[PDB]
Design an enzyme around this catalytic site. Structure first.
Site, PDB file in Angstrom:
ATOM      1  N   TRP A   1     -10.384  -8.641   2.792  1.00 31.56           N
ATOM      2  CA  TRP A   1     -11.065  -8.951   1.539  1.00 31.56           C
ATOM      3  C   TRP A   1     -11.125 -10.462   1.354  1.00 31.56           C
ATOM      4  CZ3 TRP A   1      -7.677  -4.796   1.875  1.00 31.56           C
ATOM      5  CH2 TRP A   1      -8.176  -3.539   1.478  1.00 31.56           C
TER       6      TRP A   1
ATOM      7  N   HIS B   1      -5.868  -6.324  -3.428  1.00 31.89           N
ATOM      8  CA  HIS B   1      -6.698  -6.288  -2.234  1.00 31.89           C
ATOM      9  C   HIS B   1      -6.870  -7.673  -1.625  1.00 31.89           C
ATOM     10  CE1 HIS B   1      -8.657  -2.036  -2.686  1.00 31.89           C
ATOM     11  NE2 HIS B   1      -7.431  -2.008  -2.194  1.00 31.89           N
TER      12      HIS B   1
ATOM     13  N   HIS C   1       0.646   4.232  -2.662  1.00 34.12           N
ATOM     14  CA  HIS C   1       0.338   5.616  -2.311  1.00 34.12           C
ATOM     15  C   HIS C   1       1.444   6.613  -2.631  1.00 34.12           C
ATOM     16  CE1 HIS C   1      -3.430   5.330   0.443  1.00 34.12           C
ATOM     17  NE2 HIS C   1      -3.488   4.459  -0.548  1.00 34.12           N
TER      18      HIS C   1
ATOM     19  N   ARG D   1       0.839  -1.194   0.000  1.00 37.75           N
ATOM     20  CA  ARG D   1       0.000   0.000   0.000  1.00 37.75           C
ATOM     21  C   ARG D   1       0.880   1.252   0.000  1.00 37.75           C
ATOM     22  NH1 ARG D   1      -2.968   2.781   4.951  1.00 37.75           N
ATOM     23  NH2 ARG D   1      -4.320   4.276   3.853  1.00 37.75           N
TER      24      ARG D   1
HETATM   25  C1  FMI Z   1      -1.351  -2.137  -6.432  1.00 38.60           C
HETATM   26  C2  FMI Z   1      -2.109  -2.181  -5.177  1.00 38.60           C
HETATM   27  C3  FMI Z   1      -3.258  -1.434  -4.759  1.00 38.60           C
HETATM   28  C4  FMI Z   1      -4.073  -0.573  -5.475  1.00 38.60           C
HETATM   29  C5  FMI Z   1      -3.995  -0.147  -6.955  1.00 38.60           C
HETATM   30  C6  FMI Z   1      -5.082  -0.088  -4.554  1.00 38.60           C
HETATM   31  C7  FMI Z   1      -6.083   0.819  -4.889  1.00 38.60           C
HETATM   32  C8  FMI Z   1      -7.046   1.364  -4.060  1.00 38.60           C
HETATM   33  N1  FMI Z   1      -7.204   1.083  -2.706  1.00 38.60           N
HETATM   34 FE1  FMI Z   1      -6.082  -0.262  -1.679  1.00 38.60          FE
HETATM   35  N2  FMI Z   1      -4.807  -1.453  -0.559  1.00 38.60           N
HETATM   36  C9  FMI Z   1      -3.746  -2.212  -1.027  1.00 38.60           C
HETATM   37  C10 FMI Z   1      -3.272  -2.206  -2.338  1.00 38.60           C
HETATM   38  C11 FMI Z   1      -3.792  -1.458  -3.401  1.00 38.60           C
HETATM   39  N3  FMI Z   1      -4.895  -0.634  -3.305  1.00 38.60           N
HETATM   40  C12 FMI Z   1      -3.194  -3.010   0.055  1.00 38.60           C
HETATM   41  C13 FMI Z   1      -2.010  -3.990  -0.072  1.00 38.60           C
HETATM   42  C14 FMI Z   1      -3.915  -2.718   1.175  1.00 38.60           C
HETATM   43  C15 FMI Z   1      -3.721  -3.311   2.602  1.00 38.60           C
HETATM   44  C16 FMI Z   1      -2.960  -2.409   3.578  1.00 38.60           C
HETATM   45  C17 FMI Z   1      -2.806  -3.022   4.973  1.00 38.60           C
HETATM   46  O1  FMI Z   1      -3.288  -4.157   5.214  1.00 38.60           O
HETATM   47  O2  FMI Z   1      -2.198  -2.358   5.838  1.00 38.60           O
HETATM   48  C18 FMI Z   1      -4.910  -1.737   0.789  1.00 38.60           C
HETATM   49  C19 FMI Z   1      -5.832  -1.159   1.651  1.00 38.60           C
HETATM   50  C20 FMI Z   1      -6.813  -0.235   1.317  1.00 38.60           C
HETATM   51  C21 FMI Z   1      -7.733   0.371   2.254  1.00 38.60           C
HETATM   52  C22 FMI Z   1      -7.756   0.117   3.741  1.00 38.60           C
HETATM   53  C23 FMI Z   1      -6.740   1.021   4.451  1.00 38.60           C
HETATM   54  C24 FMI Z   1      -6.693   0.826   5.939  1.00 38.60           C
HETATM   55  O3  FMI Z   1      -7.745   1.014   6.583  1.00 38.60           O
HETATM   56  O4  FMI Z   1      -5.608   0.493   6.468  1.00 38.60           O
HETATM   57  C25 FMI Z   1      -8.541   1.202   1.546  1.00 38.60           C
HETATM   58  C26 FMI Z   1      -9.685   2.087   2.077  1.00 38.60           C
HETATM   59  C27 FMI Z   1      -8.112   1.121   0.171  1.00 38.60           C
HETATM   60  C28 FMI Z   1      -8.674   1.856  -0.867  1.00 38.60           C
HETATM   61  C29 FMI Z   1      -8.253   1.857  -2.211  1.00 38.60           C
HETATM   62  C30 FMI Z   1      -8.807   2.699  -3.392  1.00 38.60           C
HETATM   63  C31 FMI Z   1     -10.156   1.977  -3.762  1.00 38.60           C
HETATM   64  C32 FMI Z   1      -9.062   4.137  -2.812  1.00 38.60           C
HETATM   65  C33 FMI Z   1      -7.645   4.771  -2.585  1.00 38.60           C
HETATM   66  C34 FMI Z   1      -8.001   2.329  -4.513  1.00 38.60           C
HETATM   67  O5  FMI Z   1      -8.351   2.994  -5.647  1.00 38.60           O
HETATM   68  N4  FMI Z   1      -7.055   0.241   0.052  1.00 38.60           N
END
Ligand code: FMI
Length: 294
Positions: free
Chosen positions: A191, A175, A52, A48
């Site tokens: 997820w 995800h 970002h 993530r």
């Molecule tokens: C290439 C990878 C990737 C893409 C493209 C991508 C794209 C997008 N993500 Fe996503 N993400 C990734 C990988 C990727 N994400 C991962 C690995 C996580 C888990 C983080 C964790 O477990 O700490 C998370 C966790 C997470 C969470 C929960 C955060 C938290 O509460 O800690 C949210 C709300 C979102 C929203 C969104 C979108 C929909 C809005 C920004 C979005 O367009 N993400």
């Protein structure tokens, strides 16, 4: 205001072996600090973080992007959209201390590549050369996408990152990793079941689970299944939109295809905005600890 050109510049005298060592340090620490987030490990959050720090890019003026490693600056570090990523940054601190020669952008992106590979995901070719830029080059908050929108929002938003339908659907497959944390994003729940193993479970869950639109404790809507999984409104939009749906079905039925497409889209995401000289080194493909017998 003219669109700047960010030319990749190899860290002085460094080569593949130097970066494999950084990869290994990251991988070894992922193995060591296995208790984080109820034993999920730091893998997901590093992915993530890589996303970002890269997703701030704007193809229109080449501002933002992974090149400058600006997340190290207060404005970006404190972006509400980056809440929770401080954990990933803290994890990388000892790594950067041991290898002070690597740029911040190279470290943030390499962290994501390392995490995906160590979690049994596809190999992600990675190129070095990102160079730290001044604090005034830090992008303003608000460039990262929202999770409470629909398919039309997602499609339009990702055009700014030069990503098409297939690239978007492939990227969202990440995800399968980690979970949402109420305190960080206003969403709660994983997820899937294999939170720290990279697979195509995201697509299988979208298609096979019985989802119900509910309100979480932050008063935000999200889709939940009796299996204990959740999907963001944007995740669910991937099966509501017919074009996205076709692709979701494709990845749910072809693990290898998903791996290959994700690898390309992820490298592209991490390289957006960077100009690689014609004589720059070829992309590096790092061996996992397992492949090295480490
Ligand atoms: C290439 C990878 C990737 C893409 C493209 C991508 C794209 C997008 N993500 Fe996503 N993400 C990734 C990988 C990727 N994400 C991962 C690995 C996580 C888990 C983080 C964790 O477990 O700490 C998370 C966790 C997470 C969470 C929960 C955060 C938290 O509460 O800690 C949210 C709300 C979102 C929203 C969104 C979108 C929909 C809005 C920004 C979005 O367009 N993400």
């Amino acid at each position: 205001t003219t669109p700047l050109v960010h030319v990749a510049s190899v860290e002085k005298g460094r080569s593949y072996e130097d970066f494999q060592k950084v990869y290994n340090a990251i991988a070894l620490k992922l193995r060591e600090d296995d208790e984080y987030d109820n034993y999920i490990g730091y893998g997901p959050v590093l992915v993530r973080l890589a996303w970002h720090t890269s997703g701030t890019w704007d193809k229109h003026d080449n501002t933002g992007g992974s090149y400058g490693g600006t997340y190290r600056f207060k404005k970006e570090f404190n972006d509400p959209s980056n809440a929770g990523l401080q954990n990933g940054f803290k994890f990388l601190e000892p790594i950067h201390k041991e290898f002070p020669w690597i740029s911040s952008g190279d470290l943030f992106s390499l962290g994501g590549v390392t995490a995906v590979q160590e979690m049994q995901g596809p190999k992600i070719p990675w190129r070095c050369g990102r160079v730290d830029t001044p604090e005034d080059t830090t992008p303003d908050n608000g460039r990262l996408p929202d999770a409470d929108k629909d398919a039309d929002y997602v499609r339009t938003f990702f055009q700014r990152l030069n990503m098409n339908d297939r690239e978007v659907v492939a990227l969202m497959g990440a995800h399968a990793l980690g979970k949402t944390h109420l305190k960080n994003s206003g969403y709660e729940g994983p997820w899937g079941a294999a939170n720290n193993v990279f697979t195509n479970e995201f697509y299988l869950n979208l298609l096979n689970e019985d989802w119900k639109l509910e309100k979480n404790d932050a008063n935000n809507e999200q889709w939940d299944s009796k299996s204990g999984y959740m999907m963001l409104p944007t995740d669910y939009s991937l099966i509501q939109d017919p074009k996205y749906l076709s692709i979701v079905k494709e990845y749910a039925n072809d693990q290898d295809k998903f791996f290959k497409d994700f690898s390309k889209a992820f490298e592209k995401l991490l390289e957006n905005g960077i100009t690689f000289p014609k004589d720059a080194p070829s992309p590096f493909i790092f061996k996992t600890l397992e492949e090295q017998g480490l």
